[PDB]
Amino acid sequence: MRECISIHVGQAGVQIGNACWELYCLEHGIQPDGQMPSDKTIGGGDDSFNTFFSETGAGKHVPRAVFVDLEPTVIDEVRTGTYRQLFHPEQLITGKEDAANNYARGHYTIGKEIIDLVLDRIRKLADQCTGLQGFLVFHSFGGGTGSGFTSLLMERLSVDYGKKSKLEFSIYPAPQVSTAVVEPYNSILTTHTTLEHSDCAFMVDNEAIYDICRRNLDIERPTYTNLNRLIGQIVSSITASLRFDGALNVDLTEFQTNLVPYPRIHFPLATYAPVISAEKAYHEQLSVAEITNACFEPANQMVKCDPRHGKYMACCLLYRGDVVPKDVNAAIATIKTKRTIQFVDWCPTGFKVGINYQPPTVVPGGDLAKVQRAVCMLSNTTAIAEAWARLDHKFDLMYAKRAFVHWYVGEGMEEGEFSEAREDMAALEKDYEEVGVDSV
Amino acid sequence: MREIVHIQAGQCGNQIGAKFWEVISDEHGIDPTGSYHGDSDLQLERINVYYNEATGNKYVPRAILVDLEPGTMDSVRSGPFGQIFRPDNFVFGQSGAGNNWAKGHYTEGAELVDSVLDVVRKESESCDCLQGFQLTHSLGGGTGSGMGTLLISKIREEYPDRIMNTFSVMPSPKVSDTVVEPYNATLSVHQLVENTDETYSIDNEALYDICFRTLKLTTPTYGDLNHLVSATMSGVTTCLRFPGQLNADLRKLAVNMVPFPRLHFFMPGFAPLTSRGYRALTVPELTQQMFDSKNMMAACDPRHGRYLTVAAVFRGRMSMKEVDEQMLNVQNKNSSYFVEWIPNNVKTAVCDIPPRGLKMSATFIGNSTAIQELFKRISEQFTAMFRRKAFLHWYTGEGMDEMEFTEAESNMNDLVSEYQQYQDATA
Ligand SMILES: CC[C@H](C)[C@H](NC(=O)[C@@]1(C)CCCN1C)C(=O)N(C)[C@H](C[C@@H](OC(C)=O)c1nc(C(=O)N[C@@H](Cc2ccc(N)cc2)C[C@H](C)C(=O)O)cs1)C(C)C
Ligand SMILES: Nc1nc2c(ncn2[C@@H]2O[C@H](COP(=O)(O)OP(=O)(O)OP(=O)(O)O)[C@@H](O)[C@H]2O)c(=O)[nH]1
Ligand SMILES: Nc1nc2c(ncn2[C@@H]2O[C@H](COP(=O)(O)OP(=O)(O)O)[C@@H](O)[C@H]2O)c(=O)[nH]1
Ligand SMILES: [Ca+2]
Ligand SMILES: [Ca+2]
Ligand SMILES: [Mg+2]
Ligand SMILES: [Mg+2]
Ligand SMILES: [Mg+2]
Numbered sequence: 024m025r026e027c028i029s030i031h032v033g034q035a036g037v038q039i040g041n042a043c044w045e046l047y048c049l050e051h052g053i054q055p056d057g058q059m060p061s062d063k064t065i066g067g068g069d070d071s072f073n074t075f076f077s078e079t080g081a082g083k084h085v086p087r088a089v090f091v092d093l094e095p096t097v098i099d100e101v102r103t104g105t106y107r108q109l110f111h112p113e114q115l116i117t118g119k120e121d122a123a124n125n126y127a128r129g130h131y132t133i134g135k136e137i138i139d140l141v142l143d144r145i146r147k148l149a150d151q152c153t154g155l156q157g158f159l160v161f162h163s164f165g166g167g168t169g170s171g172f173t174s175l176l177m178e179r180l181s182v183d184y185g186k187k188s189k190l191e192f193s194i195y196p197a198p199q200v201s202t203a204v205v206e207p208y209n210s211i212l213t214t215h216t217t218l219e220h221s222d223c224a225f226m227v228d229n230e231a232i233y234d235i236c237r238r239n240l241d242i243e244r245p246t247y248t249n250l251n252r253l254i255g256q257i258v259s260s261i262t263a264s265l266r267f268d269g270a271l272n273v274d275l276t277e278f279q280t281n282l283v284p285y286p287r288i289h290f291p292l293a294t295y296a297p298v299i300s301a302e303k304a305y306h307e308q309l310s311v312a313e314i315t316n317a318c319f320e321p322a323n324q325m326v327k328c329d330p331r332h333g334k335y336m337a338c339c340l341l342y343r344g345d346v347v348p349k350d351v352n353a354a355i356a357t358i359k360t361k362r363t364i365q366f367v368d369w370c371p372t373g374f375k376v377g378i379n380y381q382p383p384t385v386v387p388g389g390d391l392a393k394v395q396r397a398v399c400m401l402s403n404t405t406a407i408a409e410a411w412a413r414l415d416h417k418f419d420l421m422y423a424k425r426a427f428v429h430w431y432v433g434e435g436m437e438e439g440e441f442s443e444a445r446e447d448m449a450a451l452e453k454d455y456e457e458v459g460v461d462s463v
Numbered sequence: 464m465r466e467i468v469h470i471q472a473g474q475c476g477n478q479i480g481a482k483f484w485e486v487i488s489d490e491h492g493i494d495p496t497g498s499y500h501g502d503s504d505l506q507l508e509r510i511n512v513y514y515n516e517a518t519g520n521k522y523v524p525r526a527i528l529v530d531l532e533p534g535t536m537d538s539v540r541s542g543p544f545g546q547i548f549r550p551d552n553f554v555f556g557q558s559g560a561g562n563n564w565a566k567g568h569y570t571e572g573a574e575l576v577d578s579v580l581d582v583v584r585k586e587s588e589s590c591d592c593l594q595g596f597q598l599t600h601s602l603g604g605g606t607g608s609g610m611g612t613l614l615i616s617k618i619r620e621e622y623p624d625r626i627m628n629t630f631s632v633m634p635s636p637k638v639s640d641t642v643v644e645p646y647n648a649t650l651s652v653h654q655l656v657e658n659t660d661e662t663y664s665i666d667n668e669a670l671y672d673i674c675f676r677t678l679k680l681t682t683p684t685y686g687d688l689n690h691l692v693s694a695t696m697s698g699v700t701t702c703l704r705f706p707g708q709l710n711a712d713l714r715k716l717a718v719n720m721v722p723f724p725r726l727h728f729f730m731p732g733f734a735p736l737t738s739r740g741y742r743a744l745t746v747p748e749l750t751q752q753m754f755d756s757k758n759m760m761a762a763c764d765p766r767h768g769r770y771l772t773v774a775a776v777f778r779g780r781m782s783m784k785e786v787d788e789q790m791l792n793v794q795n796k797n798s799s800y801f802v803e804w805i806p807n808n809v810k811t812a813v814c815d816i817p818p819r820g821l822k823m824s825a826t827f828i829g830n831s832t833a834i835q836e837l838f839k840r841i842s843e844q845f846t847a848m849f850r851r852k853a854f855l856h857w858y859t860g861e862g863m864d865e866m867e868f869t870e871a872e873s874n875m876n877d878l879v880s881e882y883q884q885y886q887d888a889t890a
Contacts, residue, residue: 024557154557186860276561281642284853337642349682369851371844373640462850 025074026152027159027265028145029088032173033129034097035163035194037090041101042251042386043161043258044086044109047075047266049384050259056108057083071268077151086110087152089144091176093118093133093168114148116141122167124203126212127434129171138175142183149184156276157188157222159262162213164414165196165206170213177220188276190223192258195326195410197230200247205427207417208441215444218451223279223289225261226410227254228326238322239298240390252389257295257325260341260399263379271348273377278339281375282403287454288336290407293325294318294400297392304392311350311396312357315340318400319363326410333406334459335366338374344382344396351376367405368461408455415448464712465592467512467703468583469599470614472529473560473567473607475632476600478685479665481539482693483599484524487513487704488544489819490697495544497521505816508706515589523549527582529614531556531571531606552586554579560605564647565861567609576610580617587622594713595626595660602651603634603644603667612654619658626713628661630696633761633837635668636844638688643854645844646868652838653871656725656878660717663699663828664728665692666837668762677757678738690739694818695731695760698826701776701814709812710774719810720772720830725878726885728834731760732827737820746781749825750789758827761837768833768886770801773809778816779823786813804890835882838875845872 031040047053051072052061059082062068067078076084086109092098095117101107102115118137122129149155158180163169173191180189193213196206203209217224232253236245240253264275282291296317297309309317317323318340321330342351355374358364366372383397421427422441432438471480488494491510492501498521499507514522526548530536533555539545540553556575560567587593596618600607615627631651634644655662670691674683702710710716721727734752735744744752753775756764777786790811794801801808817823848854849868858868 277641280562280854280857281640283856286856352682369847369853371636371640371642371645371848373636373642375640458851462847 024069024154025156025265026087026154027074027156028148029075029086029159030145030161030176031088031090032160032162032176033092033166033168035166035169036161037092037097037101038247039161039192039251039254039258040088040090042255044088045106046255046259046384046386048106048109049386050381051076051084051266053084055105057085059084072266074156074265075262087148089114089116089141089148091116091137091141091168091172092121093129093137093172094121095119113144116144122171124165124205124209125167125430125434126171126174126209127431127436129167129169130175131171132434134172134175138179141176142179155187157190160189160191162191163194164210164213165194165201165203167209169194170209174213174216177217181220189221191217191221192225192227195226195228196414197228197233199233200229200250205430207414207421208427208431210414211418211444211448212440215447218287218447221289223283223291225293226290226326226407227257228410231325231327235298235323236390240300242390249390252386252391253298255386256383256391257293257399259383260295260343260397261293261401263343263381264341264377267379267381269379271378273375278341278375278377278401281337281339282401284336284370284403284458285454287451288403288458291401292328292330292404292407294323294402295325296323296398297394298323299392299394300390301392304394308395311346312354314396314398315351315354315358318398319358326407328404328406328409330402330404330406333404335364336370336403336405336458338364339401340374340376341399341401342376342378342396343398344380344394346378346396351378367458405455405459408452411448411452411455415445415452418445464594464714465511466525466590467594467597467713468586469513469524469526469597470529470583471526471599472611472614473600473604474530474535475604476598476607476611477528477530477535477539479630479632479689479692479696480526480528480599481542481544482689483696484526484547485544486693486697486819487700488547490816491704493522493547495546497523497547503816505705509704512703523547525586526552527579527586528553529555529579529606529610531567531575531610532559533557552582554582560609562603562641562643562647563605563857563861564609564650565858565863567605567611568613569863570861572606572610572613576613576617579614580621583618593622593625595628596622598629600629601632601634602648603632603639603641604647608647608651612651612658615654615658626660626717627658628713629655629659630663630665631655633664633666633668633841635666635671637671638667642848643857645841645848646854646858648841649845649871649875650867652841652878653874656874660713660727661720662728663695663731664761664834664837665695665731666761669760672762673736673757677736680738687738691733691736691760694737695733695826697818698733698776698778698824699731699828701778701826702812705814705816707812707814709810716774720774720828722771722805723881723885725881726771726830730763730765730829730831730834732758732829733760734758734825735821743822746785747789749777749823750793753825753827754793761834763831763833763836765829765831765833766800767836768831768882770808770829770831771805771885772830774828775809775811776826777811777813777823778818778825779821780815781813781823783813786811802885802888804888832882832886835879838879842872842875842879
């Protein structure tokens with residue numbers, strides 16, 4: 024019961040899925056062939072890891088996942104790679120021609136040809152669930168598949184599944200690793216189309232992850248490999264609540280209840296601690312109080328924005344490892360008396376806490392040090408709207424001169440879809456301003 | 464009047480409901496199998512109020528275990544006394560209520576509610592003379608909150624002539640971090656005001672503060688809080704379970720405690736306050752303590768209001784002269800805190816059997832106007848979110864309208880206004 028299907032869309036979405044699934048296997052004791060000696064219930068069970076892994080009669084633990092890209096080259100590496108025996112061929116879906124960093128191609132042109140095949144395979148996975156909770160969608164904002172195909176898939180999933188949970192891990196564009204000049208158009212187009220069709224979305228600023236790798240892990244020019252290894256850790260922290268069981272374990276839905284005050288205000292800020300190198304972690308252990316305080320450090324955020332210049336609407340602390348309530352309670356009490364967190368006048372100032380005892384695992388040949396305890400904070404701050412504004416400014420500069428718009432118009436889109444998307448973004452920015460005003 | 468039907472809904476309800484049966488089972492000398500092994504026949508004279516006697520003289524609790532998830536009930540079944548309970552009396556779902564009153568009352572709860580009532584009906588049949596119903600639940604969740612109040616309303620339709628009594632747990636931001644709790648609690652109070660005869664207002668704020676300040680527990684657990692709840696439940700039900708003159712039935716209790724039909728929210732008290740890990744209390748100590756703010760199970764200062772009615776239960780082997788002396792001394796020393804327009808409003812009972820590990824205890828039950836403080840608190844938290852309509856989508860996505868919320872808000876505000884009415888009333 025309570026199964027979750029993961030959907031990995033485009034290169035960003037697929038490569039992050041590779042990292043995530045690689046890490047879940049390591050955390051549950053699942054071998055690259057899908058075998059799990061730790062599991063005595065052969066052919067199936069009701070265990071907490073079963074929300075993410077299906078079981079075959081043979082004893083193979085199969086990810087409840089679909090990988091989609093409009094081109095073969097990225098998924099082909101999964102088919103050939105270490106975990107080729109982990110997935111059934113039918114879970115790995117490729118086209119022949121990609122969306123060429125164009126929303127219109129992924130949503131319409133190219134995407135229309137593969138959509139029903141993707142839905143069939145999602146349906147096949149859905150049919151093996153005794154009690155489907157919902158979906159986890161991994162994609163980039165900037166790519167044509169990542170933006171347009173995700174939009175189309177989201178719309179179709181709302182039609183096919185109703186109001187069954189749809190969560191996203193969206194890669195926010197950064198110049199340092201940016202592939203296209205039209206990423207701000209694709210980001211605004213996907214955000215508009217998907218807004219109504221998502222219940223919660225975790226944005227990951229590639230610049231924020233880039234900076235952490237450079238600063239905390241002392242990596243000169245971070246690769247997507249380095250980036251995905253750090254995202255793997257944040258994703259694992261948010262899904263640990265679902266993949267493990269415990270007395271102090273609070274479900275992702277309970278965090279969501281607190282994180283979403285209004286349907287459109289469903290973008291939580293993720294902050295992870297500790298991100299430390301093996302060299303810097305040798306003979307230095309960080310306490311519950313140390314890792315907790317590090318969450319209120321803008322340097323550890325998944326999105327670059329200032330929550331100290333914004334207002335909180337929630338704080339959730341998701342602990343991993345050697346953590347006891349006494350210490351968490353004391354660390355929270357300290358931050359509170361330290362009065363560093365300004366909250367909206369309309370909501371309770373409590374901190375919702377979950378704890379899983381299984382400590383964070385590390386991928387061999389990693390930059391990350393294995394720590395005894397880790398924390399992920401999910402906060403709903405008005406500061407996340409800074410990300411919306413930066414992306415909205417870039418869009419504005421280009422759309423004023425109608426720069427590159429013909430590439431979209433030539434694929435069947437109208438100028439009207441652009442202006443309508445942008446007006447939704449102005450409305451969302453206004454909504455984030457409104458929630459931050461004190462009541463009269 | 465004879466038999467009480469007990470219903471326990473949701474996580475809190477089932478946890479506190481479970482602890483209740485463990486405590487009074489030991490009191491009445493019933494082992495985890497259901498077999499009697501006691502020293503006194505005072506233990507069986509009124510056993511049939513809570514237990515059904517079965518073939519082979521084995522005693523079965525007249526308890527219904529309800530939840531929209533298997534979790535807690537599975538741990539109750541795995542528990543020490545889980546074996547005492549009738550297995551046909553475990554009514555559960557798989558969905559959960561997700562701390563949503565709308566899910567417990569209208570959508571998820573709606574799907575399970577008739578299966579509960581069939582068990583309520585079967586239990587009501589095996590009753591020579593049913594008194595009424597007892598329910599354990601929290602007001603902050605979805606199942607006990609939403610489903611519990613819908614079960615009360617449905618039970619009231621089928622049994623309109625019987626007494627409905629609850630042990631309702633009030634939310635505190637010191638115990639819970641679920642933002643929606645003030646919403647669920649206000650929705651549940653509106654229901655309790657209309658459909659219950661007696662409600663014991665068990666406040667998580669007071670239980671937390673007792674554990675921290677008085678029991679000196681640095682990191683109190685639910686089991687620590689529940690220890691004070693099980694002591695309170697054992698004390699407030701004494702008169703119903705053991706031979707006696709005062710408040711021996713639910714109806715007689717209500718007639719003594721409820722001057723006005725909406726003003727039926729009781730502030731329970733207890734002395735000595737203990738933690739699960741020698742020194743007996745004198746009759747004067749029990750009396751000072753049970754009436755002291757620090758011993759109240761609801762985070763209200765009795766000295767901020769007036770007592771409309773009081774019930775005092777003394778358990779153990781003591782002086783009935785001294786009990787009477789100290790009870791009269793308390794009333795005569797603080798006469799301003801007792802409404803003059805309700806003459807002789809404090810009624811006292813003495814029971815020879817004490818609780819486990821106590822030589823002597825005292826349980827207080829007060830209908831004080833100071834309970835408005837608890838209601839003003841939940842109201843302050845509700846209005847802060849509701850004036851900005853925050854987190855309502857969780858409720859409207861279940862079919863509810865803002866109207867239900869405005870109505871609930873009004874009824875509770877009116878109830879606070881009523882408690883003030885009688886606090887400022889003179890003879
Ligand atoms: C790290 C977060 C901890 C766990 C949590 N903190 C908070 O909620 C804080 C204080 C942090 C931020 C603000 N917020 C209000 C907390 O202390 N609580 C929620 C406790 C309850 C919590 O305490 C601890 C120390 O674990 C729990 N107690 C139990 C417990 O008693 N378990 C018992 C079984 C049980 C399980 C569930 C229910 N509902 C009832 C009983 C078993 C134990 C051995 C016993 O008998 O005490 C479980 S979680 C309440 C009373 C304030
Ligand atoms: N963190 C991270 N970002 C990635 C990765 N791959 C691509 N991106 C980012 O995603 C954006 C480009 O999107 P892609 O994933 O390559 O696009 P796509 O979905 O495959 O779309 P098309 O190839 O145009 O069909 C840029 O912002 C990249 O920096 C990855 O593995 N990790
Ligand atoms: N005293 C006490 N409070 C509890 C317990 N379990 C839950 N609560 C409180 O009840 C509220 C949540 O309701 P809960 O019973 O868990 O949800 P339900 O299962 O949907 O009815 C919060 O105020 C919790 O702090 C318990 O065992 N004892
Ligand atoms: Ca298994
Ligand atoms: Ca249903
Ligand atoms: Mg590609
Ligand atoms: Mg629950
Ligand atoms: Mg006092």
